[PDB]
Structure 1
Amino acid sequence: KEARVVINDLLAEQYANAFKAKEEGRPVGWSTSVFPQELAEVFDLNVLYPENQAAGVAAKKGSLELCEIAESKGYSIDLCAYARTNFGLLENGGCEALDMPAPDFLLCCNNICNQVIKWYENISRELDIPLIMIDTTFNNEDEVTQSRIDYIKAQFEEAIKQLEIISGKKFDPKKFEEVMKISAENGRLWKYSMSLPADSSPSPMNGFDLFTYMAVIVCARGKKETTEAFKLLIEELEDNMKTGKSSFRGEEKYRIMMEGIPCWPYIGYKMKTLAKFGVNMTGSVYPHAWALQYEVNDLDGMAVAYSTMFNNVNLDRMTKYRVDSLVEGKCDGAFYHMNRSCKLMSLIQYEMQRRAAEETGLPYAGFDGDQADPRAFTNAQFETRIQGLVEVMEERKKL
């Protein structure tokens, strides 16, 4: 029994179950990537993720047609590619490469960014469906103010009341407790498994594999199946560590940290290119993204967990996440993606990359692109930029 097989089947099972629920008349929701999923899980609700569906379509090379559709409707190419791709899916009534049913309700959380707010207002107006908002106001202070905590917990309550109406069920305190435990564990397996690269040398996996497994921790964070899935994976990764093996082809001459989401429409090309150069990512900020840890039945802690996701904390803390991931990963350099779609991540990258480089003493480089719009990435450019970094690392390497 292989981890990848179970993972892919578990992922594909989320979609099927969603279509089934749709068929039987049970509500299906669409949710942002770091929403408090525990709130809908306790109700056994089927929840799909627009960001995941869009990355999947982009990988399958079919996000262009959808962005062009959204664009013909008046949506500016300036807007995040995930939203354009999703608007095209809605207007087109789905797609062929990776289809999913329309939502009956939405779950939105701006801890990752504020664009999903507008994006979701549109879907709600478009389909005339309930929109549950968990607003985690940006943390300018090093710590989450008590005001933010009370406010978030209060919204957790509003969400629950809304979901009782939507699901037609009553909140079960006992079930909500088990999901908390389940969610807490999967959060732990995610941070642990995806952190192994920081050791080994060679790393037990190719940094990019993280983004494949990233799908499970995103759509099924409160399910027992995920727990077993990550357990099988771990066992395989450790088996590799102990045998000096890995999914990363060839020798691992260089260890780096890539900042940002990879360009899904060119994930294949990006994999090959880095491999031929002996470059592998063993430093990542993502093992923290879905860690989301809190004590069982501790709404204050849960609130803090979701508000502290790295996209919602001051520049200083954002910078520390990188510096830390570089060091712990024993990285030789930093590779930055200037993502045309993600303004939140792109508009603080300059200052952030300056600070991390001046603290870690490691060299860096960057490239232009987009996670779902194939028009923003240029292959020829990616190659010369990573090669440029390689020259520097190899240069400082041999004294």
Structure 2
Amino acid sequence: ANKYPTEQLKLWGKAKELREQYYMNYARAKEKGGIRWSGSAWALDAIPAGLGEDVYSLTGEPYAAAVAHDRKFAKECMDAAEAYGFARDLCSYMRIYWGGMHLNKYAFGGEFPKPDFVFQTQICCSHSKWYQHVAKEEKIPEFYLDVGVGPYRDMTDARLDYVANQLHDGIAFVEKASGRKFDDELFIKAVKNEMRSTSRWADICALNKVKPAPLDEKTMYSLYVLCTLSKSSQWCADFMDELYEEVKDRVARGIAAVPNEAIRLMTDTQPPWSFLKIFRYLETYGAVSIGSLYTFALEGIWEDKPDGSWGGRTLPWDKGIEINDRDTAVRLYADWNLSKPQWQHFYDPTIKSDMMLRIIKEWQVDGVMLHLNRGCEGLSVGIMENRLAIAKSGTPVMTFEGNMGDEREFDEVRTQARVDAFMEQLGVRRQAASAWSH
């Protein structure tokens, strides 16, 4: 079947080890007097990093996704949250997280480790409600950064002021909650590391534009996750640099993630974590998923490049912009995060429609498989308008219903049959095109 050379990733084991160490560090944070905090993967984690090198987060959505990979434990956690009285149609990550806190069990062993404080970003409505319940049940201080200032391309000075001024409140909050003095040098280092890691993850994804794709999306789920754990850490920034070197070498050598690659797919949001085997099934057709706006930009930070293409955002110091003081760092850090592609559709779904159409073009995509994800209001808003814009463009597109965290709303059998039908459709379209353009 295999037209292309293929090779397994050399840095795979390190990617798995860094993730395991992150989770073990959170649990062991108190052995040497460290700080623990919890919040979204979208929290501005450089702020707590100004309190020391022994400040360990637990990001809520990646943790809940880890639980969702264990169907039995995920079921138990959701049953506990339901017994408390929460509606079953709330965010499945949030329900899993709540249930595991009530059960007092950590997915990586032991009791559920109590955070010292909540440090959260609010853009999805459930961002507040998730940690309001946690902070009451753990009796801990809580801080929320309201980033709801509308699309980055419409940004005003006052909108940026609102986010920057809240971040200064956040500094005061984490000092009070932890009892430590915030250090400008550690903070600036963390801002710079977050800029590095998020831009570099984008650089790696942009390498997937070539045929054959050096990475498949299932492999990428174990790589994009590191920025969702601690994007402002030195370890994450340095690993993104190492990974970029490996993927560059794969491109240089013509290496394919999928040796029989013939069809390039794009997905969208939050895949069903206990059903990633669907991607291996697609590989039997010679289909590889090259990524998604979700994989590329849940944390990756992007810009338009000199040729009009999409690439990692330029680091300020490569642009003559110095970061030498707290106030400059805070404003640039706010601006960096407000450019996040995966925040724009909370205001205007056509921004995401255009972003998806651009990915289809630049990554040379043959077909799109859209998850209508009942488990996540925040990433699903606007999904049907995105589908319509893709349908109008002429690129084949199918949908399937599911839930990234709650298997009870995902039908494996029906979804696999729809995906099979889609593979047939792509073959038919190829035959018709060949016949017309003989």
Normalised to the residue count of structure 2, the TM-score between the two structures is 0.84
Q: State the match for 1:358 in structure 2.
A: 392
Q: Secondary structure at the match of 2:368?
A: strand
1:302 correspondence with 2:333: yes
Q: State the match for 2:289 in structure 1.
A: 281
Match of 1:137 among 148, 162, 168: 148
Q: How much does 1:333 deviate? A: 1.2
Comparing 122-131 with 304-313, greater Cα deviation is found at: 304-313
Alpha-carbon distance in structure 1 between the residues aligned to 2:272 and 2:413: 14
1:110 correspondence with 2:122: yes
Alpha-carbon distance in structure 1 between the residues aligned to 2:378 and 2:14: 34
Match of 1:14 among 10, 22, 38: 22
Q: How much does 1:123 deviate? A: 0.7
Q: Secondary structure at the match of 1:208?
A: helix
Q: Which amino acid aligns with 2:363?
A: G
Q: How much does 1:49 deviate? A: 0.9
1:334 correspondence with 2:368: yes
1:225 correspondence with 2:256: no
Q: How much does 1:243 deviate? A: 3.0
Comparing 143-152 with 320-329, greater Cα deviation is found at: 143-152
Q: How much does 1:264 deviate? A: 0.2
Name the % identity: 22
Q: State the match for 1:240 in structure 2.
A: 250
Kept after mapping to 1: 8 A contact 2:106/2:113: no
Q: State the match for 1:373 in structure 2.
A: 406
Q: State the match for 1:185 in structure 2.
A: 196
Over 3 Å counting, the alpha-carbon distance change for 1:141 and 1:197 in structure 2 is closer
Kept after mapping to 2: 8 A contact 1:340/1:370: yes
Aligned residues: 394
Q: State the match for 1:253 in structure 2.
A: 262
Over 3 Å counting, the alpha-carbon distance change for 1:51 and 1:357 in structure 2 is same
Over 3 Å counting, the alpha-carbon distance change for 1:276 and 1:119 in structure 2 is same
Alpha-carbon distance in structure 1 between the residues aligned to 2:109 and 2:213: 31
Q: Secondary structure at the match of 1:195?
A: helix
Q: Secondary structure at the match of 2:267?
A: strand
Q: Secondary structure at the match of 2:401?
A: strand
Alpha-carbon distance in structure 1 between the residues aligned to 2:248 and 2:343: 33
Q: How much does 1:266 deviate? A: 0.9
Alpha-carbon distance in structure 1 between the residues aligned to 2:137 and 2:224: 30
Kept after mapping to 2: 8 A contact 1:136/1:148: no
Q: Secondary structure at the match of 1:365?
A: strand
Q: How much does 1:172 deviate? A: 2.1
Normalised to the residue count of structure 1, the TM-score between the two structures is 0.92
Q: How much does 1:334 deviate? A: 1.1
Kept after mapping to 2: 8 A contact 1:109/1:116: yes
Kept after mapping to 2: 8 A contact 1:277/1:387: no
CA RMSD of aligned residues (A): 2.1
Q: State the match for 1:151 in structure 2.
A: 162
1:5 correspondence with 2:36: no
Q: State the match for 1:43 in structure 2.
A: 51
Q: Residues 322-378 of structure 1: CA distance to partner in whole angstroms, max 9, x if unpaired? A: 11111111001111001111123334111121113323x201001111111111111
Q: Secondary structure at the match of 2:87?
A: coil
Q: State the match for 2:353 in structure 1.
A: 319
Q: How much does 1:22 deviate? A: 2.5
Q: Secondary structure at the match of 2:232?
A: coil
Q: How much does 1:185 deviate? A: 1.3
Alpha-carbon distance in structure 2 between the residues aligned to 1:396 and 1:174: 57
Q: How much does 1:148 deviate? A: 2.1
Kept after mapping to 1: 8 A contact 2:269/2:292: no
Over 3 Å counting, the alpha-carbon distance change for 1:298 and 1:24 in structure 2 is closer
Q: How much does 1:38 deviate? A: 1.0
Q: Residues 258-310 of structure 1: CA distance to partner in whole angstroms, max 9, x if unpaired? A: 0111100111x212221122221124213233234563344333223323323
Kept after mapping to 2: 8 A contact 1:142/1:317: no
Comparing 339-348 with 365-374, greater Cα deviation is found at: 339-348
Alpha-carbon distance in structure 2 between the residues aligned to 1:104 and 1:171: 16
Q: Which amino acid aligns with 2:272?
A: C
5+ residue gaps, structure 1, are none
Comparing 114-123 with 164-173, greater Cα deviation is found at: 164-173
Alpha-carbon distance in structure 1 between the residues aligned to 2:329 and 2:180: 23
Q: Secondary structure at the match of 2:231?
A: coil
Q: How much does 1:135 deviate? A: 0.4
Q: Which amino acid aligns with 1:144?
A: M
Q: Residues 151-177 of structure 1: CA distance to partner in whole angstroms, max 9, x if unpaired? A: 111110010001112232222222222
Alpha-carbon distance in structure 1 between the residues aligned to 2:17 and 2:389: 42
Alpha-carbon distance in structure 1 between the residues aligned to 2:158 and 2:241: 38
Kept after mapping to 1: 8 A contact 2:195/2:336: no
Over 3 Å counting, the alpha-carbon distance change for 1:174 and 1:228 in structure 2 is closer
Over 3 Å counting, the alpha-carbon distance change for 1:374 and 1:382 in structure 2 is same
Q: How much does 1:4 deviate? A: 1.6
Over 3 Å counting, the alpha-carbon distance change for 1:97 and 1:271 in structure 2 is farther
Over 3 Å counting, the alpha-carbon distance change for 1:217 and 1:371 in structure 2 is same
Q: How much does 1:256 deviate? A: 1.3
Q: How much does 1:316 deviate? A: 1.9
Q: How much does 1:178 deviate? A: 1.9
Q: Secondary structure at the match of 2:119?
A: strand
Q: How much does 1:247 deviate? A: 3.6
Q: Secondary structure at the match of 2:372?
A: strand
Q: Which amino acid aligns with 1:102?
A: K
Alpha-carbon distance in structure 2 between the residues aligned to 1:123 and 1:363: 43
5+ residue gaps, structure 2, are 1-8, 302-312, 317-322, 434-438
